[PDB]
Amino acid sequence: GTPWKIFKNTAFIKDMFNSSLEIAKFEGAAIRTVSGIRGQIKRALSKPE
Amino acid sequence: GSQLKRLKASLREQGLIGPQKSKKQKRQNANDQKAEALKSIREQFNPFQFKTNARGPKFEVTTNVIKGRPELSRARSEEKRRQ
Amino acid sequence: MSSLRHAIQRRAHKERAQPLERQRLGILEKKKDYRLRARDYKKKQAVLKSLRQKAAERNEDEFYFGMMSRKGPGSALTRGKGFTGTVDGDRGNKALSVETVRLLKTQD
Amino acid sequence: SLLPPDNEVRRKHETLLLDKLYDMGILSTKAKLSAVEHNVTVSAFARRRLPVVMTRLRMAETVQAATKLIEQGHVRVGVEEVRDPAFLVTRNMEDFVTWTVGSKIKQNIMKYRDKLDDF
Amino acid sequence: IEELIKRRILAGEFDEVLRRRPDMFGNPHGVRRGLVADEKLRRDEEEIKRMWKEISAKLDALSSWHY
Amino acid sequence: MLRKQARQRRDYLYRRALLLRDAEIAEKRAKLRAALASGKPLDPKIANDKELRKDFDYDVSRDIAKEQGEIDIDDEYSELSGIVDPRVLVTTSRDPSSRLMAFSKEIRLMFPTAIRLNRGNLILPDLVMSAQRERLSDIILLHEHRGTPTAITISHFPHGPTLMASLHNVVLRADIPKSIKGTVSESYPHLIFEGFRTPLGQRVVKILKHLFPPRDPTNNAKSGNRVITFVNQDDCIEVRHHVYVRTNYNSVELSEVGPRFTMRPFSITMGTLENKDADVEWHLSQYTRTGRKKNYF
RNA sequence: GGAGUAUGGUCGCAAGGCUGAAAAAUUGACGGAAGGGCACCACCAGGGGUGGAGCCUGCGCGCGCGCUACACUGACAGAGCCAGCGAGUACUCCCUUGGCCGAGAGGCCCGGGUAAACUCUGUCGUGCUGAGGAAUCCCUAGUAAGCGCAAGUCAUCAGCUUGCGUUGAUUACGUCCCUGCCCUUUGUACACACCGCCCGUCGCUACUACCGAU
């Protein structure tokens, strides 16, 4: 994906998925930016599918 | 009333906490049910075995309450997700 | 060991570069860049922290002698709109009394 | 320490001496008799006198000048003023020893920090 | 968890805070307050009592009685 | 007041760093003392540090008394543990919602010496001020998500440690109609704890079980009507609130009356609620390599 | 070599089934009557949700919880006058018609989808242009409620969480009558002062004698 907005910690990420369904399959997903920050996918965002 | 008082009075009704009787009371009792009573009492006074609405019905309709059990439900499902 | 390795073993990896359809957003931050960011951010937050340390444990009632001789922070209401809680150190000018100004203006 | 270690009265007065001196501030811990032995010191007393502890609370710049202040008398304790510059400030009173009522000093502080109430 | 509770309440133990008395430390036997060699050790003990009494006089009295 | 609490709390910190140095010492001192009774030989450094030997001769009695359990350790709890009754207030978040407010009423009821408080328009620094001017044991928050509570935040006041935990698997008091539930007894409940086997487990049990009143000790194992349980597995401490009647010396029946929680503690700070600049003690470490493999508690 | 510490492997015991799932009690078990203390899960004065319609996280089509709408507390035009929290070299809602300069990868330019509030001045006037039952649940002071502004903190939380400020009432603030819950009827301190042997059904114990088999 690529980040859409960036708050302090929690970042939205947009262009990775085609559906909330695919996301909630990948609930709790072990995600990782290139720079080496680890992280976790937690919920699908609702308004842009 | 309280959980405690209702359980105490129901059990005294059930004779399982009533005072230690005599031989003579034992003879009278042997001279003159409780299983299903206890099971239903248990299921009641541990109400969190299940969900209900607190409200009661949005509309009374007359023609001739547990709302489903989270614990058995999620248990059965996890068995299926296993299998 | 170092003599138990090929030269092509010793060869390097090169880092990838930002997708050319995306150079708009600046460089592609990798681990060098990340740690340099977090170096500076840890440092500046630790300095903020030690500052709030001193402000919380601040005695309400101290008294040095610069207080008779400086110009304080004051507050929002005191200075009004040019208020930043730092305190003013005079650049080095002063009120010239008359005779000096006369001699200067004479030279001018 | 000469008393055998296993005694009640020993235990009671270890605790008593320690916690009492600790509430006199002259220590730093309250669990070590060896610290009482080679630590309890007239120097620590002096650093719990009054002017030294008002330097520590930052009333004034140097403990000399602090002596000069409290000799003029701007420095209150509790509700009294204090002249005797050996008023040994125990630890429950370090939090209280503050400036007096009608003091040019207190008004100077309020001058610098810009709240100078004339009332 | 209901099983564990059952075990403990039958075999009654809880990890509760209790109400420890404020005067265990000074009244280690807890008397009611109303109507009612070893010699060398005893001498040393009353001796330390005397030293302590005198120092505590000096201690309160030095501290100017905030204690 | 305020200069006083600043005074004492920093003195606690500095005395901890003191205890660090001296317990590093007493580690050595321990081995000396054991050798005297044992006659087993010792480390030669221990045999020949002179200030250590003299200092032994002074500071024996602490070691043996701690072996006896004669004293309880220096602690932000040990000052007033079973002496005086801890009063506790429960507050909601800033703008509460109604179901949340009912659930807070429920856990006020579970504690016996509590008050609830409408938070309303109140800066949380001044709520800490209200604390240290009414000498509370404990502040407690609640944060809902949408009608469902999510996090609680125990603080121990005047200055003590704070737990902060998420919640899950919550049930209210108020999903059951009052025809079946009822007013629950405000008797001093017992407490039980299962599976806390770290020193950190004992920290969290300490900050929990010093919430409740002191039981009277004469017949406490015999009396009593109400029992609160804390059990833990996979660092998700689950807590229930039960009430019981003893039908026999061989049989007993329980009734479940409180809300059912699982909370998993994710911030434990020797440091109160306002001080975000305080020393954390254990935080929950996701995002690491084996923060999932290991457990605390 | 000695002393410790670990670590693993070896060895012996534990490792032979009258057996076939579902008490203790001179101290105990259980009441009852009186008397006190308490509580927006009690009384009393009010207030305020949800529950009516739409939206949807959640939980188990049902269900609330939040958001929206619904008119006199109106609409339009002006005039004036007030906050607090926030600073990581860091921040963007699209995605698309064209064209520019780009042998090619792009970059352009043009199109399409430090507050609300409040006060005052003046213009027009109820006009699908309808504030939510029975029930239920909550609330006694900077509280109910209103109003925005920001942040987005290793758990949760953007279909929202959490902060900070702004304006700020009514109504009890007493009483155990209903509902309950707890605690007295033991101890834990003595002067004056006062009170003056609570009650029930059984258990356990010592003794007494009775009855009937062996």
- One-character DSSP codes across chain D: --S-TT-HHHHHHHHHHHHHHHHTTS-S-SS-HHHHHTT--HHHHHTTSHHHHHHHHTSSSSHHHHHHHHHHT-EEETTEE---TT----TTTTTT-EE-SS-HHHHHHHHHTT-----
Give the ranges where A1-49 is alpha helix by DSSP (H): 20-25
Among C49, C52, C57, whose Cβ lies nearest the Cβ of F6?
Answer: C57
Whether F107 and F186 have beta carbons less than 8 Å apart is answered as no
Which of D96, D114, D115 to mutate to probe the C interface, most C CBs <10 Å?
D114
- Residues 6+ positions from F206 with CB-CB distance below 8 Å: F75, F77
- Residue F189's CB is within 10 A of a number of other CB atoms, namely 25
The answer to whether the Cβ–Cβ distance between C33 and A37 falls below 8 Å is: no
Among C61, C73, C75, whose Cβ lies nearest the Cβ of D109?
Answer: C61
Q: How far apart are CA F275 and CA F125, in angstroms?
A: 9
The pair of three-digit structure tokens given for residue F115, joined into one six-digit string: 């008050």
Distance of CA C46 to the CA centre of its chain: 13
Q: In chain D, what residues touch E67 (CB-CB under 8 Å)?
A: 20, 23-24, 90, 92
Resolution limit in angstroms? 4.7
Smallest CA–CA distance from A29 into chain F, residue: F287
Touch between B and D (at least 3 CB pairs under 8 Å): no
Polymer length of chain E: 67
Q: How far apart are CA C6 and CA C8, in angstroms?
A: 5
Q: Does D32 touch chain F (CB under 8 A)?
A: yes
Closest alpha carbon to C1' of G30, residue = B19
Q: Which nucleotide is nearest to B71 (CA to C1')?
A: G60
Q: Does F287 touch chain A (CB under 8 A)?
A: yes
Q: In chain F, what residues touch E4 (CB-CB under 8 Å)?
A: 192, 194, 229, 231
Q: How far apart are CA F5 and CA F128, in angstroms?
A: 12
- Residues 6+ positions from D87 with CB-CB distance below 8 Å: D49, D50, D77, E64
The answer to whether the Cβ–Cβ distance between D30 and F74 falls below 8 Å is: yes
Distance of CA E20 to the CA centre of its chain: 10
Q: Does F14 touch chain A (CB under 8 A)?
A: no
Cis status of the peptide bond prior to F158, with omega within 30 of 0: yes
Give the closest-approach CA distance of A33 to chain C in angstroms.
9
Q: In chain F, what residues touch A38 (CB-CB under 8 Å)?
A: 287-288
The answer to whether the Cβ–Cβ distance between F82 and E17 falls below 8 Å is: yes
Q: How far apart are CA C90 and CA C95, in angstroms?
A: 12
Give the closest-approach CA distance of C30 to chain A in angstroms.
4
CA of F185 and C1' of G200: distance in angstroms?
27
Q: In chain C, what residues touch A2 (CB-CB under 8 Å)?
A: 22
Among B16, B42, B44, whose Cβ lies nearest the Cβ of F180?
Answer: B44
- Residues 6+ positions from D79 with CB-CB distance below 8 Å: none
For tokens 């604390």, what's the residue? F131
Q: Characterise D110 by phi-psi region: left (phi > 0), alpha (psi -120 to 50), beta (else).
A: alpha
Q: In chain B, what residues touch F247 (CB-CB under 8 Å)?
A: 11, 16-17
The pair of three-digit structure tokens given for residue F90, joined into one six-digit string: 């429960």
Whether B7 and F181 have beta carbons less than 8 Å apart is answered as no
Residues of E contacting chain D (CB within 8 angstroms): 44-45, 48-49, 52, 55-56, 59, 62-64, 66-67
Amino acid at F4: K
Q: How far apart are CA B29 and CA B23, in angstroms?
A: 10
CA distances from E49 to B3, D15, D16, E62, F246 (A): 58, 14, 12, 19, 53
Q: How far apart are CA F216 and CA F228, in angstroms?
A: 17
- Residues 6+ positions from E18 with CB-CB distance below 8 Å: F82, F214, F215, F216, F217, F220
* Strand G positions within 7 A of protein Cβ atoms: 3-4, 23-24, 28-31, 41-42, 48-52, 57-60, 62-66, 84, 88-95, 105-108, 133-140, 142-147, 151-168, 179-183, 187-190, 200-203
- Residues 6+ positions from F172 with CB-CB distance below 8 Å: F99, F102, F103, F106, F259
Whether A14 and A2 have beta carbons less than 8 Å apart is answered as yes
Give the closest-approach CA distance of D1 to chain F in angstroms.
5
Whether F254 and E2 have beta carbons less than 8 Å apart is answered as yes
Q: Which nucleotide is nearest to F280 (CA to C1')?
A: G154
Closest alpha carbon to C1' of G25, residue = F249
Phi then psi for F231, rounded to 5 degrees?
-125, 150
Among F19, F22, F60, whose Cβ lies nearest the Cβ of D5?
Answer: F60
Amino acid at D83: R
Q: How far apart are CA B55 and CA B69, in angstroms?
A: 18
- Residues 6+ positions from F16 with CB-CB distance below 8 Å: none
CA of F198 and C1' of G180: distance in angstroms?
43
DSSP letters along C52-101, please? HHHHHS--TT---STTTSS-----HHHHGGG--SS-----S-----HHHH
- Residues 6+ positions from B32 with CB-CB distance below 8 Å: none
Q: Which of B5, D62, C63 is nearest to F245 (CA)?
A: B5
The answer to whether the Cβ–Cβ distance between E17 and F244 falls below 8 Å is: no
Q: Which nucleotide is nearest to C25 (CA to C1')?
A: G92
Smallest CA–CA distance from C57 into chain D, residue: D57
Phi then psi for F273, rounded to 5 degrees?
-80, -45
Q: D touches which chains (3+ CB pairs under 8 A)? A: C, E, F
Q: In chain E, what residues touch D24 (CB-CB under 8 Å)?
A: 59, 63, 67
The pair of three-digit structure tokens given for residue E47, joined into one six-digit string: 């001796």
Q: Which of C98, C71, C68 is nearest to C82 (CA)?
A: C71
Residue F146, CB, strand G, below 7 Å: yes
Task: Find the Cα–Cα–Cα–Cα dihedral F233, F234, F239, F240, rounded to 10°.
Answer: -60
- Residue F184's CB is within 10 A of a number of other CB atoms, namely 19
- Which of E31-39's residues contact partners 24+ apart within 8 Å by CB, and which partners? none
For tokens 């060869």, what's the residue? C11
Q: How far apart are CA B76 and CA D2, in angstroms?
A: 72
CA distances from C103 to C24, C92, C97 (A): 62, 20, 11
Q: How far apart are CA D99 and CA D112, in angstroms?
A: 16
Smallest CA–CA distance from F245 into chain E, residue: E9
Q: Which of F239, F211, F214, F210 is nearest to F227 (CA)?
A: F239
